[PDB]
Amino acid sequence: HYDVVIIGSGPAGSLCGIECRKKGLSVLCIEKEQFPRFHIGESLTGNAGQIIRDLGLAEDMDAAGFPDKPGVNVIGSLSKNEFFIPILAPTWQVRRSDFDDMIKRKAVEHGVEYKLGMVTDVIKDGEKVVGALYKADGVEHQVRSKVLVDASGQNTFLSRKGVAGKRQIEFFSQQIASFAHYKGVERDLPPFSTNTTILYSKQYHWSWIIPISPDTDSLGVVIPKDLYYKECNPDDAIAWGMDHISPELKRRFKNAERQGDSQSMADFSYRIEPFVGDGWMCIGDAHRFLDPIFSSGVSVAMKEGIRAAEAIAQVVAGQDWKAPFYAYRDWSNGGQQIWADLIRYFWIYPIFFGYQMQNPRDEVIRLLGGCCFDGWKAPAIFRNAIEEYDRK
Ligand SMILES: Cc1cc2nc3c(=O)[nH]c(=O)nc-3n(C[C@H](O)[C@H](O)[C@H](O)COP(=O)(O)OP(=O)(O)OC[C@H]3O[C@@H](n4cnc5c(N)ncnc54)[C@H](O)[C@@H]3O)c2cc1C
Known about the structure:
- This protein is α/β, with parallel strands linked by helices.
- The protein has one domain (1-392): FAD/NAD(P)-binding domain.
- The protein has helices spanning 11-22, 46-54, 58-63, 96-109, 157-160, 225-231, 234-244, 247-252, 297-316, 322-348, 350-355, 362-369, 378-391, and strands at 2-7, 27-31, 68-76, 82-92, 113-116, 118-125, 128-135, 140-150, 167-169, 175-183, 196-200, 206-211, 216-224, 257-267, 270-272, 276-277, 280-282, 288-289.
- Strand 1 (2-7), helix 1 and strand 2 form a beta-alpha-beta unit.
């Protein structure tokens, strides 16, 4: 028996476990993969940076060789339009295998119990979730929980089991990402050498370059699903990007040497509703995924883990789940909708978006730093333009 059982130990599950422990709750985290393990999504927001400082991890970040992130340089190729989004507060580019392991060790330090295992089923008592089944070695185990937290990322465990809602996928923005790590990439000149670079051409055609260590850079090429299936495996997709997205690519990778195989993965934005219920909740990618063009996923996952523990504590302490879980739900929907709007606005009006950075700018900087979860003008501008556009 535990107060809280967390499925998965990415940024959402790890932060949820840490904050649950800070509220004095007993916590079991079941994670199916042995750490450290590779994972994509390497560029952090200023707000993720602040959580990391709060955990007391800043020195360890520098020690791990994670480059400082000055901001993101966005370059459009069809018109050479270029803009730079400065970082809100100091943050980093990370190798996720090592980063996720660091956060996980902090969770263990706070007294989270970990099991290597794959959660496979929930245990119900009528409508109520009261625990879970998981496989470790050759063997099925049972655990009982007051709240089962699904932090399974894009595995969307509770959705797949029909406990949570079905995925509602955004049909018009379906993309496939292909990526690999390289050495020998030409970096921007200081003070910008370790910025994230985003290159885009047509709508939903884009690429990233992220320095993740002193010598290594992550390259991604992201294109519409149909184009990928039509003209492209992940090697071919990356080559297509090198050829068609921007000349900056062939230039910077002139002397680059790939480390390890390339990979592809769905980049479909989705949302799952409901994502809270009696005895359970979802946090992070387990209920919602946004186009990672602005590198917000880890920041969002961490924030949701933190905010969920608040709700969880109230329920473990005897309050009916509705008021607290619905407050979490509404808080999450509020902030995620702002991110979603920013992204849709960018894809519709990428040039107008950029120029916004010369407009007396501060709001967007804060928003892209992650301040999306707390009167600002920007959210309404994005919302209004998108509604008009859709109506048109
Ligand atoms: C192409 C791409 C690029 C991205 N770039 C960025 C970026 O630059 N910056 C950024 O911040 N975000 C980025 N993201 C998003 C980011 O990767 C995710 O939002 C983030 O990892 C979410 O964290 P999570 O904890 O929710 O899920 P995850 O990090 O995926 O963690 C989930 C964990 O759950 C475990 N698990 C799953 N199912 C089970 C089960 N049944 N039992 C036990 N354990 C289980 C998995 O092993 C996994 O470790 C990107 C995403 C994509 C697709």
